[PDB]
Design a binder for this molecule. Structure first.
Ligand SMILES: CC(C)C[C@H](N)C(=O)O
Ligand SMILES: O=c1cc[nH]c(=O)[nH]1
Ligand code: SF4
Lengths: 1011, 1010
């Protein structure tokens, strides 16, 4: 037949494959109106109709991220200097550092950063009104694509850390507590177990106090995070996780005991030997309207303090022993108020069965107090909003509310709010929920706080810098102070107080504290992991070092790198005076290797820079200064000579006499390829010359621009080198302007020369070079360089036979502080190798569960395998099915078993660096050692698919035409003609939506004709 | 001194540099509350006052993109198969293709795609309610980051094309005007110069009709795009630009003529010899309420039909000859309605000086019919919204409105709407604008359409598939038909009608048309540019071909590539039967060369694939078939043998005998490396054997994995090759999982071997190889391979000395249709070299100018030199400066210097491919040939800066500590210690914010010691 034509079955496979177009298409406006329905993803503006939410407490946050989404968004962040988002965070989170960690897949280091400054970091990531806080200051607001989703990123890293089930540990800088000063045994009382006291108690325990007790009124802990914030925004297991992290530090919590006359008072505390007290009881009473006096829940009237804890008790497994019936809230519901309380009452009422919800405001839309994020959740669930109304009468008939009468409110010229008596509204409703806010109005609670001063708002007065009340041993924070209105500011109040409580207690025991506040960071057992490594007789405190490059232009720069934590550093390559060089400009440019993406995370640079412009005398003196000040940090002098025996011995002896721990020989000088590093005989002789001249170890820095880099490495070993640095830059031309001129272009003539490519774009070249050397010359020390930009990629190089890791381009893309990310990331990766329960993870990445847009898909029988993509009529069918399950799960009200949280324990010793070096090399082989019997095929998880057809298009025009793409559902199916080439997996936007599995059917290679 | 320590001056410059912190920070809640306001970028929820907008008609669209933002968003689009965004677009725009073109910097090809299906492509990008159309179908809605900004991308590409000032041309597929059949001179009339008629006339002109007249009532053209849609959403120069493209086709517009019983009627048109008519007059009258009859504008009452045209005429330069004043709208304004019209009245009233605006509507918020995009503009400008209110009477005192009395409305059991007489709102107001919608009511207009049938809605009845009325020669579309809600649906109405008008006219002249409607595309002189090239005695219809790789796995794929338009193709490498290979799996994986970014635009792939698993007989038969069916497309047979003279001669003769235009020798076989292609002696011998065996040209495919690729290129030439392909893949390992297992991992043993890296990550290596071969062997044909993914990158290889361009990974990332992007993009790059007025562009990219969020910075004397970043109290000061000049601009009032938009003409010959090949080599040389006297320094454009400090951080930890970063404004300044290394420019997220300029102060290399 015609071999180069598709048979009919393939032609039909290809039916939806893209084709070039020679005419404009004709589609009538009516046909287009009818077709639009089928593909619709987003809310339909014409839908007056809210879908059913009864008993549906699934996550509704727009900000929740999965790993795929988190990685994309962390890479987008500019990671700014002196960042304005951190300025705008009330707990001063180092957002730049934690987002950097996320971008490098170091979720532990990110979470550690987060919890060091905010012990409720996961709660805050979910509930912070970021548009009025950190995100409000984000520099990327100045771009069309907009500000960073900081809260969703914070939530993601904290959720991953929660899943690792690692405990908090006592501050490892402290002495053993037997040898702590008596002052740290002072009895400390905190009142109320909400965010403020949890934060305060956490920071005090970090400081070393061993007798800290939170007295909580209720039977449950967590404050409003537990009793009122809905489960569909803040899951209760988050609160429990943060509480258990506190209790890891020894904080005790006693429920059932109140700050109140005839119970706990400041007097009883003092008489019982408590030395300090923190008041964190919040605002316990609802703000009331006299109009509603006498109305009962039986009639359908609630305050927010009645209603929200009723919903929480029935929806938060682990709050009570009670399995509360969800309140039956049938009919029309009036919610009064314009803060967070009102909007959570409105969405919660829908979960209780409300038919319609009215949010009524005394003022206008311009005056809502909740942030636009929280408003949007009520708007998208079709709550109705009624401005400029003040309630006047409630109509009760038949024992139940049937209506509320309102009057119109207005402003005048002076801007005073009047009520117009003749302008009334009669609104039919079955349930009324007042959500005006909260107050402190309990005389017995205020009496228990005698004798502290209260202000005009009848709240305890504090110094806003120290949180101290008018009694020096009594501090206060959170909602009770009437300044904070957010979880993060309540957390910050307790943070601020902890330092000055510490100051006060220490002073009572006759001890001073430092004038500069110094609260400890957050620690786990991961931080005790040893990441030192020995190589060629040198001891490295960690395997990360600065390559000989632009970040080591000046020795002052190395000094700051050592102060930041870098384990070692190379000098910029230097030479004898007679070889002094002069740079041109421009000389370092961004790579075009990943398209027109500007800013953070450039995939390469190209440079036409020479060796150091600074003198050997400068470098030799600098090496002596750096080694005197940083004896545990390895300093390697990089040096270059022309092919001259006297020159190489003179220079190498000068560098050794300066005190360098080792030398690195830059083999780039030309001679007679062209560079000495490209000729094995020249490399052997240079190494022999240097070996005769010095006694300290030295390493030959190899170029990758050679046919056989193993032969160059072997030559250096034969000549006496103690190791090799693999590799220098790859020779390239980065591109041309459309007029043909180069970049970089030097002078009026716009000239250039070939430069060196660095960064992640050359990492496959460097990894292969390290691997081939490590396999051909086993045990010969390798210092790796080329695209290392994270602990994860560093570990790939260690696994491939490198002992230590040089970095340049990742610092050019950022700054020296990436070292803290690399060190915490390597500790975490090694630590997790000891945890049996996490063996399904890939490093710090949890096994990918079936999810849509960061949220797990409901595991429902009738929802699975029914060909229901997430659009058009199929989505409405999924909603129906989800709604029907939620109702079924209601009529049977069992299942309250929230697992008790217990940390995982290492089951083997934590590997050291020496344990992982070279351990991936066994998997490498020749092609003849790869099985062609054990073939695979692709398989697609339709629940994760976002219907783009990229797998189909890649198999059609780059593969085997083996995927069926459904014209109505846009769901792909791999068929039996798959060859397992794996291109589809490689182009799919969803991580792990496509998997390769063992082929179970007979396999025949497609040969076209016989043989 | 201590050389390794910073002196006090440098320690001061480093003050804001990041440092690893040792402790948790202490900052009181009060202090944080005060400091927050200094850095604030976005709206403050606590601010209830509108920022004053009087006479401010600057663009307020959230969707507008500059080039930097457009490139990011276009790379993000998945470019989907059977894309649902296109299904949800009423004009069926190929969104996948035009967005692909933008991502490849081919803005001409994008614009051509847009205007091919939508002749108002720029208007629609600006004003489409995309959440109810294309964007509402976007697959990326299923991701956290969300749907693609399709309209903003459409707007960006069309705006660049508008700036190129290139005209539309007559359909080049048509016969000369001389030889057109008589039917195409039929006199055609269109009524109304709005979107519907502009579209219909445009498509009729494309089909070849030469006598098309649009009759417009007003003295201005463009319909509601001109008369009512505000200048701050749709600038008038967009309308003018789209009209002039239509006029390029010969469509005539006559203003001051109306369809009305006493002027133009269907009868008079028939009497005058018009053979077809299209009714596109829209809905000319406002819908009114009895409650407002008698009220004048001087009493404070307007309809939207009265108000919005007054604001348009005053704010749209060139819309009228009469310069006219902005309406005097003072005090509180009530706008009645909840559609597009009402929200435009509300925002336009703030431009006229309103103190307060109430949008009042009779149903609830859930009932608002404008799209959320439109609502948000009024909300962000602090308009108040009053639901459930219906007007009952207007209070007039002293000759002017003082208040409107409303009654509350509600929804009962049925859902039917009631009015509550006892429940009243007395709302003070000085101005009332009714924006209830629009109707056709004029009896003289309706009588002029006799005798076509109207429907119960009192609108002309049409067949919804043909747009034909009850009279066969009269069609209608747009708002007048009552289906279209939007500019794009009106455009599509005219597009639909044009085919069936064409069908009717042809049949009236005794001619049939195709059973399948076939409207022509949009054409410009760019499309006539010749991009053919000769190389090694072979003629290539274009320089783009498929590399020997996975896209040529089967000859049926090469067939579809040729049908798509690819100039040439390589077979997958094949061998003799005895050398039959068997592939393993998995064997092709995504690159990790640009981090964890999945989906489109992978920066590399790695493969451990072998040569073809299909036999020589299959490939030889297939080459014969392909050369039979595509004689003008070049087919190159890729072949490989072991180091055996008889084998290479046998296989090359078999491929030659099949009809291959040329052979490509794959030198990857094992025999200073282990592959034949790594040793010049072996390459020279292999080429010699093949040269003795065959007479057609052959090319040696060179590996980059060699010390000196010139040596193996010269060996191929010495052996008799007619050229070389540079280059094959780079040897690499793409990475390991955290447990040490590799990817790809083959079998239960999880084994791998070294693979070949392809894609954009290897482009610097391939460009180096091509340029160095072209300099060493001048004139020797080079076929380039490695990271070619656009016409722009292809042109870099032609400039580097290649003649033709092989592609693999860009197709793996997409599909065969990228060839159309490559071809139009290369035509555009060559065409633009002939346009003197555009010499300051870089290819298709206009010269970047001061912008923030892709919107031009106002060049006002008071805003500049004045250290005002776009945040906190500085932003307030900027908006207070801007607002005062807008008021000053209300008086310093000009609108009488527009610009006759005349297209740029080539003023030099358009280069052929042969004219550009090798032209970059003149700039390449040794390091010694670079000047070290002509040094540069960095300079930052503060108006474009977004205050991230990345320049500062890079100079601090990778440079010369030469940048000051201000602690209060977060603005950087380059100081005199700059060395011009250029790292800061290279990391800045804003294109062209940092510039390198010639050093003017004395230059001294920093030596450390003397
Ligand atoms: C090494 C060169 C900078 C010369 C140096 N100034 C002397 O001594
Ligand atoms: O060895 C060197 C010197 C300058 N630039 C590089 O990339 N490598
Ligand atoms: S990197 Fe660019 S945007 Fe950022 S501060 Fe520097 S000049 Fe401004």
């Amino acid at each position: 037949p015609v071999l180069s034509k598709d048979v009919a079955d393939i032609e039909s496979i290809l039916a939806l494959n893209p084709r070039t177009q020679s005419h404009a298409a004709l589609h009538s406006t009516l046909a287009k109106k009818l077709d639009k329905k089928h593909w619709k993803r987003n809310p339909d503006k014409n839908c007056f109709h809210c879908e059913k939410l009864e008993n549906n407490f699934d996550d509704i946050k727009h900000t929740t991220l999965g790993e795929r989404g988190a990685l994309r968004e962390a890479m987008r962040c500019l990671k700014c200097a002196d960042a304005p988002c951190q300025k705008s965070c009330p707990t001063h989170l180092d957002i730049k550092s934690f987002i950097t960690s996320i971008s490098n897949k170091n979720y532990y280091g990110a979470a550690k950063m987060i919890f060091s400054d905010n012990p409720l970091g996961l709660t805050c990531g979910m509930v912070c009104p970021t548009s009025d806080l950190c995100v409000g200051g984000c520099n990327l607001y100045a771009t069309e694509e907009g500000s960073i989703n900081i809260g969703g990123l914070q939530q993601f890293a904290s959720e991953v850390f929660k899943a690792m089930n690692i405990p908090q540990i006592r501050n490892p800088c402290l002495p053993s507590q037997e040898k702590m000063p008596e002052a740290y045994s002072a009895k400390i009382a905190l009142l109320g177990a909400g965010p403020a006291s949890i934060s305060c108690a956490s920071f005090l325990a970090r400081l070393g106090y061993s007798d800290i007790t939170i007295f909580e009124k209720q039977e449950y802990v967590g404050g409003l995070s537990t009793s009122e914030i809905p489960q569909f925004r803040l899951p209760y297991d988050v609160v429990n996780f943060e509480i258990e992290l506190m209790k890891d530090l020894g904080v005790k919590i006693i429920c059932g005991k109140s700050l109140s006359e005839n119970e706990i008072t400041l007097n009883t505390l003092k008489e019982e030997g408590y030395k300090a007290a923190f008041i964190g009881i919040g605002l316990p009473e609802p703000k009331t309207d006299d109009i509603f006096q006498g109305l009962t829940q039986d009639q359908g009237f609630y305050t927010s303090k009645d209603f929200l804890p009723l919903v929480a008790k029935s929806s938060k497994a682990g709050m009570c022993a009670c399995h509360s019936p969800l309140p039956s809230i049938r009919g029309a519901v009036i919610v009064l108020g314009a803060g967070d309380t009102a909007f959570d009452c409105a969405t919660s009422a829908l979960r209780c069965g409300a038919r319609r919800v009215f949010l009524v405001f005394r003022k206008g839309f311009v005056n809502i107090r909740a942030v636009p994020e929280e408003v949007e959740l009520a708007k998208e669930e079709k709550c109705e909003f009624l401005p400029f109304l003040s309630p006047r009468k409630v109509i009760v008939k038949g024992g139940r509310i049937v209506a509320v009468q309102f009057v119109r409110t207005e402003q005048d010229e002076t801007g005073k709010w009047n009520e117009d008596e003749d302008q009334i509204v009669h609104l039919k409703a079955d349930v009324v929920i007042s959500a005006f806010g909260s107050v402190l109005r309990d005389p017995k609670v205020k009496e228990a706080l005698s004798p502290i001063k209260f202000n005009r708002w009848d709240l305890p007065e504090v110094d806003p810098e120290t949180m101290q009340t008018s009694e020096p041993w009594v501090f206060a924070g959170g909602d009770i102070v009437g300044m904070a209105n957010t979880t993060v500011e309540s957390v910050n109040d307790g943070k601020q107080a902890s330092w000055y409580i510490h100051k006060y207690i220490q002073a009572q025991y006759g001890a001073s504290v430092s004038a500069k506040p110094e609260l400890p960071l957050f620690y786990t057992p991961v931080d005790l992991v040893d990441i030192s490594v020995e190589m060629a007789g040198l001891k490295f405190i960690n395997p990360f070092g600065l390559a000989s490059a632009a970040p080591t232009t000046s020795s002052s720069m190395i000094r700051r790198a050592f102060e930041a934590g870098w384990g070692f550093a190379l000098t910029k390559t230097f030479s004898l005076d007679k070889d002094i060089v002069t740079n041109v400009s421009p000389r370092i440019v961004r790579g075009t290797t990943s398209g027109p993406m500007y800013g953070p995370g450039q995939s390469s640079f190209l440079n036409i820079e020479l060796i150091s412009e600074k003198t050997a005398a400068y470098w030799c003196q600098s090496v002596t200064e750096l080694k005197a000040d940083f004896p545990d940090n390895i300093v390697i002098a990089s040096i270059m000579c022309s092919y001259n025996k006297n020159d190489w011995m003179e220079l190498s002896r000068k560098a050794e006499a300066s005190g360098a721990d080792a030398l690195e020989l830059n083999l780039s000088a030309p001679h007679g390829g062209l560079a000495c590093g490209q000729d094995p005989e020249l490399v052997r002789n240079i190494c022999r010359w240097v070996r005769q001249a010095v006694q300290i170890p030295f390493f030959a820095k190899l170029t990758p621009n050679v046919t056989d880099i193993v032969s160059i490495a072997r030559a250096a070993k034969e000549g006496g080198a103690d190791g090799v640095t693999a590799t220098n830059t790859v020779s390239g031309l980065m591109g041309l302007k459309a007029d043909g001129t180069p970049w970089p272009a030097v002078g009026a003539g716009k000239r250039t020369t070939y430069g060196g490519v660095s960064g992640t774009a050359i990492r496959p070249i460097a990894l292969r070079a390290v691997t081939t050397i490590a396999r051909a010359l086993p045990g010969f020390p390798i210092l790796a360089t080329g695209g290392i930009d994270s602990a994860e990629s560093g570990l790939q190089f260690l696994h491939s036979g490198a002992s230590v890791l040089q970095v340049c381009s990742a610092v050019q893309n950022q700054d020296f502080t990436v070292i803290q990310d690399y060190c915490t990331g390597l500790k975490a990766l090694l630590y997790l190798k000891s945890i049996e329960e996490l063996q399904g993870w890939d490093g710090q990445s949890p096994g990918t569960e079936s999810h849509q847009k960061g949220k797990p898909v409901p595991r429902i029988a009738e929802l699975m395998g029914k060909k229901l993509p997430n659009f058009g009529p199929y989505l409405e069918q999924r909603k129906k099915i989800i709604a029907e399950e939620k109702m079924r799960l209601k009529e049977q009200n069992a299942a309250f078993p929230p697992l008790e949280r217990k940390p995982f324990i290492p089951k083997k010793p934590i590997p050291a660096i020496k344990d992982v070096i070279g351990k991936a090399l066994q998997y490498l082989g020749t092609f003849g050692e790869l099985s062609n019997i054990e073939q695979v095929v692709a398989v697609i998880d339709e629940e994760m698919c976002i219907n783009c057809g990229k797998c189909y298009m890649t198999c059609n025009d780059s593969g085997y035409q083996a995927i069926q793409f459904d014209p109505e559902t846009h769901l792909p199916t791999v068929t039996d003609t798959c060859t397992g080439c794996t291109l589809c997996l490689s182009v799919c936007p969803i991580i792990d939506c496509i998997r390769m599995v063992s082929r179970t059917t007979p396999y025949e290679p497609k040969r076209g004709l016989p043989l």
